[PDB]
Symmetry: C4
Subunit: 388 residues, 4 copies
């Protein structure tokens, strides 16, 4: 009935507890589970759901062959009940395309899907399950967006888009929507030099997005958005605890206003919670590939170029495949604070496991606890040999 | 709570954006997807859904053999959630039969299904999911109707029916229903010489239907209906941009009041939006077969027998199979105007692909944008070889 | 909110129109469709649904072997959406057992299921999805009930039960329930000599049940129930148009107060609408087996021992298998009268088709029209060879 | 809207009637049924549902291999509609983990799931489908809980947990939750010497839990909880009718305040209804293995160390496999009393049936009747050979 306002701070994060896990690849070995990738989680006022980009085929289906490909006409943003797998029979299509974001403003949900060829892509903005606005490519080079939830304040939902090179300067815009309509957009400002796939969360201070620099940087760029003034700034996480993948080894001095060098033209979507002494960063354990996942408590990581971990938690062992990760919170939960949450995409199949011809994933998700909880590890759990 | 009134004009159509796509044949290669044909889309005040005539078997099921056939006892009008495929487990049966139409009046939905042998068919009119009225065949020769949504104004929902020859003069009637009851019917008047499978939409001016002349014409007949007076007129689209299939090549002078000659005893269901300078016509790209699909902006196509395109958009490449197409709009969307939408049936299997023994389809659907959006193309996407 | 009252007469029946059909055996050849038998249809104030006794296995499942058997621990009353098939994923279990009835009183639904061994069976009465009352066997010989819907008036829902011999005198009781509680029961009175599987409907005059005499009669017994006084009478349909199966050929004089002789120890569940000159009887076409189905207009069939047909309609050809049939009506439909409806069970498999090891069925259902509609025929439609 | 209060006594139990049965293993031979174990039943004010711990694979899926294992990362508490089987498409995930309980307080449902390695497990407490509180292991040895429903009074829901040895003294705590928050916890007091897997029910006197002593006892420990004062006591069922499995033969004197000896380091979850002369105990028929199930009326079993049966009912024949059993009631049913109910887990597969590589179960459930109903027996019904 009313637009949600960001009126709370983050809860104190002392550990992470299991929130959701769908075991989609295990189950999909023998049931009609859709091939997906680029998953996320997003809450409505009365329900939280899993989201992902379908590939328009099941895993056991013959059309799973070739699903390493990123952008076909057979992709769509789907949602399904928390911790169920994405099945043909339980998945709700939000919009058609191969790059997405979605968020609820307290009244209704906005979902955005981009489709088209590389040089002529377009975004369609849906609100309350109807198409409301459209945005054409401005740089004619793979218009693309967050691949995780956006965040709203008093009806205003900012979204970060990029159009242009994946290996050099590109044209990033921040759009501000209300009820699906474009209030305003602005070109990226600040010191971030390349922006992709922002993972965002909101709290009383404003909206914070942790993104992927695909060009030169292995530190992560950050965009901080004021959804009331509809303005933003950008920089990088200052910490020498580097969180992109692949990436160099951790130095003792990070970079606040420029890419930390060593790995070019690659990256992975990731996230962080930047909150002074309550700061936690996510990253793959491997510096070379999308394997393992850990959380590290790094005080003042955003602003302190010498900051190091003082606590951590393993989420996925280095022996197990990970992938994309992103932030979300249940803005409609009871209490005095917003509980930080995240998901990790657990990619199976190609390119790392090429005895099968498909690429898909499952999801694991955690939220923060004020307790100091014991840790487990959370693999996808499927045996590739079963699919041969 | 209240009957919908047609109080708005069409939004300005400057391009078309992706609205829905179910990838039904791809998914049905390995899941329980019903064989269908003659699909459409129709909105309720709170949801839009896909519709089609099931064949009462799945694609992988052995009973898919022989589904090129049009009129069996195993067919039914089904509906299912937007962009999901029509599965055994998610499809809702609206009524039983092999020719249909359906529309919501703002309070409840009317669905009409025709069944029976060729010489003794009958229509059953359902309203709010209950049978309310029945109409017996009047010419004893395949009583048949729109195969896409009807349109309502202040509770009155006109529907076009034909009974009689597919290859000569037939008996077409326009029925006017309210809450499923027959208010009135009238015989076709005007200059259209053969009428089948009308695709309709409504706006403040009245209801406009673009139909199929199966006898002599390769231009499309148009019926214009006043749902208040409950009267109609008919003619053909005057434009030399011919939109039936198969069809002759485009001349420079069309025909307003008679069939444009060249192809007899054949046709395909199609649609148009006739709105002065905002006029757009749909057609297959091929003049010979149901392949490809394009939209063409043809100013005053209804009334100008010299009118030619000034803009266009490819929807499906000529290399890919298409099929039926029809109009629908979300009459319950926010805003100052009604956004034109359409679907294209993408037929797979027989007769064109006879290495399989079945005939089915998937759906792609677009709505108009006031932006000039880049275009993609939207194939069914299934590989026939996988079904062998 | 309020209990339904039977305040209307039957609509004039001039023909029958298609209402529902699930094609369950066709679809179940390749999808997870439950094996069933003894189906029926019953309406809530907001929805009508199919009902049947599951066998606790799918058709393609190996446990379908042996499903000719009537009474296992794996049976349950299930319901599912109108004209969908009964699938593992869409079927709602109403109660556990191998003989059932169910009806909505305007506020909530009562469902009754009998389970147990032959000598120790018991009925459990559910109301608003909770068990409320239980009834133990009184004759210790296969306690059994209607296998189609009951009917309610002002909260009172009468149900006919039989316990005792299938081949001689048995102990039949009429129970009167309200909100699942037993108000009263009475022993059968009148001239009916054996009662099984009553098919009932209600109108302003009271409740009329047409049953099966399994002992000596090939005419059908009738029980007429006053749900206000909670009393009943019984006799047989007087008409020489005999409607049990198997049965002798039609004579010119029927029997009002005794079994018409010729076939012993057998029968089939059936139904009729007894309404003076608006009387219609259902029967199998074959006199020997459960094949074919037809409706016959037989004026005053209940009371006139010379009555013959003056009109009819074929529903299922004699070449096709039929089975059980029963009555139901949508008591919550709009209008001045109740529209008579019925279903026919289309049995496939054993004993008639013994190349498969299972027994199941599909459903076809019709309702009456005041029009004189053309007739089709409605086979199950499955090819047995596909299951081999 | 209001918290449920325990204001009624138990209905008089004179026999047991069939309540639910899902036939999950039969159906799962050919449909997408999840492998489960540790099932139970629990009611909301408007619905009752089946619950269990999924293994994150279907039975026919290759990942069913190894599902005898108790604690993997692929387990979750799921719920699904009463008497349906737990399918991929109909199961709702309540939380992630390998030990659970769940209960509705009249306003919303609390669900608790424990996950983690043996030495670092943690409980997450969910309320109204959101995580609210977390509890870390206190003895670092397989933190574990009830595996059946908890019970609430005026918002307070007590839950019994154990952490520590399965073969010697352990650390049992009773937690008191309200809206998912921890009001209080206390260490176990009284004479019970080992506590696992409590089965609880509530009535006006308070909450009664019947548990499993896995250390030395083959009588069952009982915890009696006052949810208002938030205090408890414990002892054993005094009766010589012993109800653990495996167990010694029944003596003539039981033990009230110590384990009855004979079988060490083993047990099974079970239940009882302790209500003076209305007392009924459940147990496996076999003293050696989890086979058969019976109910026995044993007056004053809780307090009388000489008490013997005066009536009984067989639920599952000794020839058929059983397993876990537990209590639940529909606290929201109409009437003057609470109707006692229970479920029995019917385990199939390993270790007893090792020709298959999986372990799963189906469910049968009964509630009490004031009638003296005839008894049947209720096997799982699946043929193991079909899975080979
Ligand atoms: C039951 O569950 C519980 C809860 O989960 C388990 O307890 C958890 O155990 C884990 C594993 O040990 C802990 O995670 C690690 O945390 C440490 C940080 O804590 C340590 O350091 C703190 C800071 O110390 C500094 O300040 C203090 C101030 O006093 C000073 O004294 C000290 O000398 C130093 O100056 C200490 O405060 C802290 O002590 C506290 O906690 C102790 C328990 O942990 C306790 O005993 C003490 O009493 C006190 O209370 C503690 O010493 C993280 O550093 C560590 O993360 C590093 O290591 C992991 C591998 O294990 C690696 O994956 C990480 O990426 C990271 O190391 C990489 O990055 C570093 C930063 O750049 C770099 O320096 C490293 O060389 C390394 O870099 C290399 O690898 C990376 C990744 O591949 C690559 O990118 C680089 O390029 C390079 O190749 C862990 O996160 C939890 O904190 C702990 N939780 C709790 C609540 O205790 C418990 O074990 C379980 N029980 C059982 C029986 O299993
Ligand atoms: C990114 O995406 C964007 C957006 O989608 C892409 O841009 C789109 O590009 C497509 C493809 O080119 C365009 O579709 C075509 O549109 C033309 C109409 O526009 C042209 O003509 C207009 C009218 O010109 C007349 O009036 C002007 C007045 O000034 C006069 O000067 C002129 O000489 C003439 O008298 C022009 O106004 C218009 O110019 C404007 O737009 C230009 C860009 O398009 C721009 O550069 C200009 O500055 C200006 O703004 C333009 O010249 C349609 O005619 C055409 O449709 C025909 O051709 C296709 C094949 O491509 C065919 O399938 C169609 O059926 C049709 O041709 C058949 O029918 C004709 C009519 O009877 C007949 O004459 C033809 O011979 C042909 O008939 C044959 O085939 C059919 C079918 O099989 C058969 O039935 C017949 O029997 C026979 O065999 C296209 O629809 C879009 O309009 C355009 N959109 C936008 C917004 O720009 C962009 O390309 C993408 N970018 C990249 C890098 O990929
Ligand atoms: C398009 O669809 C429409 C609508 O469906 C189709 O029209 C329908 O056509 C069917 C098939 O013909 C009709 O069903 C039959 O109806 C007759 C009853 O109607 C006839 O008899 C009436 C009574 O006549 C008596 O009174 C009059 C008073 O004037 C008197 O004059 C007359 O001599 C006699 O005394 C007539 O009133 C009626 O005429 C009216 O209707 C005519 C059209 O039908 C029309 O032309 C007239 O102008 C007038 O308006 C008409 O003559 C039923 O008798 C018949 O049912 C019997 O036959 C079928 C086989 O076809 C059988 O299965 C039935 O069981 C039954 O016969 C068995 O039972 C009898 C009773 O005991 C017994 O006597 C028989 O020997 C037989 O018994 C044997 O078989 C059974 C079963 O196996 C076994 O149990 C026994 O033991 C024994 O072995 C049909 O139901 C529809 O009524 C008709 N509908 C309409 C609205 O017209 C149309 O055909 C379709 N169009 C096309 C092109 O396909
Ligand atoms: C249709 O359905 C109906 C309803 O279901 C069926 O009727 C049911 O039939 C069953 C099966 O017979 C009954 O269950 C049994 O109940 C008896 C208890 O009732 C008997 O005993 C009562 C107490 O007697 C004492 O007090 C009286 C006071 O007057 C005194 O006179 C008497 O001498 C004695 O001192 C009697 O009151 C009662 O009589 C009443 O009911 C009669 C009908 O049952 C009726 O005829 C009378 O007129 C009167 O009304 C009756 O005699 C339970 O004892 C029994 O349970 C034991 O046996 C089963 C095996 O059958 C076993 O599984 C149980 O575990 C248990 O036996 C074990 O435990 C004992 C206790 O420690 C031990 O002593 C045993 O040696 C044995 O222990 C061994 O095995 C266990 C398990 O493996 C192992 O753990 C041990 O270590 C050891 O190895 C049954 O539960 C129902 O009560 C009855 N229901 C009704 C309402 O009638 C009907 O049959 C069906 N019809 C048809 C045709 O099929
Ligand atoms: C082209 O690669 C971009 C995205 O790369 C990732 C990945 O796994 O690394 C998959 C995304 N796939 C989808 N969202 N479908 C790509 N993003 C797109 C739009 O292809 C990358 O960020 C460089 O610009
Ligand atoms: C035993 O046969 C009775 C019922 O027979 C019919 C049938 O196909 O003829 C199936 C029913 N099957 C089920 N309802 N499950 C039986 N009725 C029962 C209770 O077995 C018959 O009416 C004689 O008493
Ligand atoms: C370790 O065994 C415990 C539980 O044992 C049972 C069983 O079938 O006997 C399965 C449970 N499995 C699950 N709940 N998943 C176990 N409980 C646990 C936590 O493993 C036992 O009570 C001893 O402590
Ligand atoms: Ca990078
Ligand atoms: Ca034509
Ligand atoms: Ca008989
Ligand atoms: Ca024990």
């Amino acid at each position: 009935r009313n637009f949600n306002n960001l009126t709370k701070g983050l809860c104190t994060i002392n550990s992470w507890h299991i929130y959701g896990k769908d075991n989609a690849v295990r189950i999909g070995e023998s049931s009609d589970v859709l091939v997906t990738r680029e998953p996320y989680v997003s809450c409505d006022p009365d329900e939280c759901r899993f989201y992902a980009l379908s590939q328009g085929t099941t895993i056991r289906g013959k059309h799973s062959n070739g699903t390493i490909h990123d952008r076909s006409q057979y992709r769509a943003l789907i949602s399904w009940p928390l911790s169920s797998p994405p099945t043909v029979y339980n998945s709700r299509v939000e919009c058609i395309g191969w790059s997405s974001t979605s968020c609820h403003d307290g009244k209704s949900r906005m979902s955005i899907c981009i489709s088209g060829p590389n040089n002529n892509a377009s975004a369609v903005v849906w609100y309350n399950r109807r198409p409301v606005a459209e945005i054409n490519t401005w740089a004619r080079n793979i218009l693309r967006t967050q691949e995780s939830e956006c965040v709203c304040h008093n009806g205003v939902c900012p979204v970060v888009f990029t159009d242009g090179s994946a290996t050099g300067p590109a044209d990033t815009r921040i759009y501000y929507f209300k009820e699906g309509k474009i209030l305003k957009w602005e070109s990226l400002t600040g010191t971030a030099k390349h922006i992709e796939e922002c993972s965002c969360y909101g709290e009383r201070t404003g909206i914070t997005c942790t993104c992927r620099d695909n060009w030169q940087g292995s530190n992560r760029p950050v965009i901080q958005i004021d959804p009331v003034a509809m303005t933003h700034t950008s920089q990088y996480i200052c910490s020498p605890v580097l969180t992109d993948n692949p990436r160099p080894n951790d130095p003792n001095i990070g970079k606040c206003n420029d890419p930390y060098p060593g790995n070019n033209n690659n990256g992975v979507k990731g996230f962080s919670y930047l909150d002074g002494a309550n700061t936690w960063l996510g990253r793959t354990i491997s510096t070379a590939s999308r394997s393992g996942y850990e959380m590290l408590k790094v005080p003042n990581a955003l602003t302190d170029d010498r900051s190091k971990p003082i606590q951590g938690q393993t989420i996925v062992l280095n022996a197990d495949w990970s992938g994309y990760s992103g932030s979300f919170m249940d803005y409609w939960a009871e209490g005095d604070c917003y509980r930080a949450c995240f998901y990790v995409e657990l990619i199976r199949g190609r390119p790392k496991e090429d005895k099968v011809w498909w690429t898909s994933n499952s999801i694991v998700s955690m939220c923060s606890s004020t307790e100091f909880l014991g840790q487990w590890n959370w693999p996808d759990g499927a045996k590739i040999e079963y699919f041969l």
